[PDB]
Design a binder for this molecule. Structure first.
Ligand SMILES: Nc1nc2c(ncn2[C@@H]2O[C@H](COP(=O)(O)OP(=O)(O)O)[C@@H](O)[C@H]2O)c(=O)[nH]1
Ligand SMILES: [Mn+2]
Ligand SMILES: [Mn+2]
Ligand code: NA
Length: 610
């Protein structure tokens, strides 16, 4: 007849231009999802501007008239976040995806059988793009033609995803030319609202919360996401690819894909080093990644604020790239005070989601610390006039900026270097109101892997385990991931970074933070820097090395309560090790490596002799 040829529906580009396997992915899914048109994205400025104005004319976004090319999306309140409960990974065997927990409920991932997924898929995708354009987004995670970069193709029915993916990845025609006949991750996305609409459209924001499902199929190199337009559910390069699929790839291939910022720190003498840090969301990665140091002569430069791909090179340096092309940061809390470098970044060419709008076309959120002129009013993220009298924030707590990384005033000159940046330190941390000192240093690589494994952080009151800040993101069995980290010591050449753990959030008996934080965290970074150099600035404790007395620069800082801030209590740490023991036994068990169990035994013994 005319085959399975969708050429007649192509409104930009050509199916004949596509590499063979890309064409097959596009056409097969056009046959399944029945889009009205196919738009192959070129990544051009013209494409982007027109798509924005189109969304503008449909009421999907508003233009923010105060700024150079900035935009505002307000969502359906049912679709406001990446949703872990609807997030699953498919493998033949459950144990390959998560360890089998002794308690029967795993905190370390959600598995679904191939059978169950096929039924779920068939219930969702057939005809799901009826009446819509299927956009084909060819994208690079990493600098174009970096040896560490990986290519994806995302099919989506959301122009919001297209625009946001232009920022957060490298996308367009240059990627298709770079890809050629190579392998790529297949990323399928639908908002799940075929036309004609069966359910009312809320806030011009297409979604299907009842059928929302974010699936990963590592053995097929597929990510298939249905029903949410938001964040990590729809922007498939970010979590789905650059952590969940990429952690699996990394394990197979001998590298690491982690939930880590990469920042550069320069002393007053001009001396430079790169550091990576894994904190859970809402524990300050973006802030640290673009920190404005208070300590004079110190400089911080940003490589990435969220994801790090790391591979030992043939010299044994741990090379890291940021696979992202932008920051997708939580907007609330961002002020000139807390994060001035973010604020300079987001003044132009930025897409805001679920933040408030001022009457003069500006953006507003909790913690912005920017007084408004009398007469200037605020429209909340729910499209209502808002005042601080109300018992609701003007912006959703998970609201966002999505901004190009290149616009960061302190973007590192090597942030796109195809070889990556050499990592000399790896920092773990989160929110611990009690017990855990400002900073310590792991005693060995094995100890450091244990420190990552043991991470706990206040929920954003409950304290939960979040190993390596990867709890939401492991692409495979966490015990095996532990073994993969430990295996890095068994290769000759590898120059293993020093591992540290931090805590900004230690609080006193009256619930006041014992440490100021923010730009004062440069004093902790200072202590860390010297240690990589070999400075004799450390005191041994049961948990690791801490700063020696007077080793931290507290100058310009008045009287910080250092005794409480560095206190290490036998009673706290004996409870700590017991809790950790029971967690690893329950959640990891048969897959817990011998070396991590040994480190737990060693820590317990050192605490017992306090
Ligand atoms: N008290 C305190 N709060 C902080 C510090 N760093 C970040 N925060 C707060 O933690 C919240 C999350 O910051 P953010 O950079 O979004 O964390 P991310 O989600 O991990 O990238 C914001 O409300 C920040 O103001 C700190 O050093 N001390
Ligand atoms: Mn962030
Ligand atoms: Mn993150
Ligand atoms: Na809207």
């Amino acid at each position: 007849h005319n085959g399975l040829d969708f050429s007649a529906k192509v409104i930009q580009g050509s199916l004949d231009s596509l590499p063979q396997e890309v064409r097959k992915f596009v056409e097969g899914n056009a046959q399944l999802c029945q889009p009205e048109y196919i738009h192959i994205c070129d990544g051009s400025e013209e494409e982007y501007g027109r798509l924005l104005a189109h969304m503008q004319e449909e009421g999907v976004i508003r233009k923010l008239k105060k700024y150079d090319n900035c935009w505002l999306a307000l969502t359906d309140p049912r679709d406001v976040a990446r949703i872990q409960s609807k997030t699953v990974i498919i493998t033949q065997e459950q144990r390959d995806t998560v360890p089998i927990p002794k308690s029967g409920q795993s905190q370390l991932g959600r598995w679904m059988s191939e059978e169950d997924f096929e039924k779920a898929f068939n219930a969702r995708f057939p005809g799901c793009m009826k009446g819509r354009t299927m956009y084909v987004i060819p994208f690079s995670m990493g600098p174009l033609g970096s040896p560490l970069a990986k290519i994806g193709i995302e099919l989506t029915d959301s122009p919001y995803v297209v625009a946001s993916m232009r920022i957060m990845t490298r996308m367009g025609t240059s990627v298709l030319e770079a890809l050629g006949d190579g392998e790529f991750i297949k990323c399928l996305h639908s908002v799940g609202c075929p036309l004609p609409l069966k359910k009312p459209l809320v806030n011009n924001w297409a979604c299907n919360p009842e059928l929302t499902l974010i699936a990963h199929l590592p053995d097929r190199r597929e990510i298939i996401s249905f029903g949410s337009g938001y964040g990590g559910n729809s922007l498939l390069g970010k979590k789905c690819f650059a952590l969940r699929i990429a952690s699996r790839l990394a394990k197979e291939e001998g590298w690491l894909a982690e939930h880590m910022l990469i920042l550069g720190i320069t002393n007053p003498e001009g001396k430079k080093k790169y550091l990576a840090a894994a904190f859970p969301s809402a524990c300050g990665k973006t802030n640290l990644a673009m920190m404005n140091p208070t300590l004079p002569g110190w400089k911080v430069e940003c490589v990435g604020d969220d994801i790090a791909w790391m591979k030992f090179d043939a010299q044994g340096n741990l090379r890291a790239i940021n696979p992202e092309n932008g920051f997708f940061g939580v907007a609330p809390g961002t002020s000139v005070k807390t994060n001035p470098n973010a604020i300079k970044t987001i003044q132009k060419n930025t897409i805001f989601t679920n933040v408030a709008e001022t009457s003069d076309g500006g953006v507003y959120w909790e913690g912005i610390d920017e007084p408004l002129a009398p007469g200037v009013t605020i429209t909340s993220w729910k499209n209502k006039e808002w005042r601080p009298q109300d018992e609701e924030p003007c912006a959703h707590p998970n609201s966002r900026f999505c901004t190009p990384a290149s616009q960061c005033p302190i973007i590192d000159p090597a942030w796109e270097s195809p070889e990556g940046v050499p990592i000399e330190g790896i920092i773990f941390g989160g929110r611990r109101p009690a017990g855990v000192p400002l900073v310590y240093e792991a005693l060995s690589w094995q100890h450091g892997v244990f420190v990552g494994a043991a991470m706990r952080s206040e929920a954003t009151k409950v304290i939960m385990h979040d190993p390596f800040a990867m709890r939401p993101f492991f692409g495979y069995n966490f015990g095996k991931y532990l073994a993969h980290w430990l295996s890095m010591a068994h290769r000759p050449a590898a120059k293993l970074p020093k591992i540290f753990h931090v805590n900004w959030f230690r609080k006193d008996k009256n619930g006041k933070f014992l440490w100021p934080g923010f730009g004062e965290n440069s004093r902790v970074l200072e202590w860390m820097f010297g240690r990589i150099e070999g400075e004799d600035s450390a005191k041994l404790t049961p948990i690791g090395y801490v700063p020696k007395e007077d080793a931290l620069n507290l100058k310009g800082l008045g009287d910080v309560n250092v005794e409480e801030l560095f206190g290490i209590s036998k009673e706290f740490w004996e409870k700590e090790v017991e809790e950790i023991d029971k967690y690893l036994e329950d959640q990891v068990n048969a897959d817990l490596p011998y070396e991590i169990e040994r480190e737990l035994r060693a820590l317990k013994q050192r605490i017992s002799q306090m």
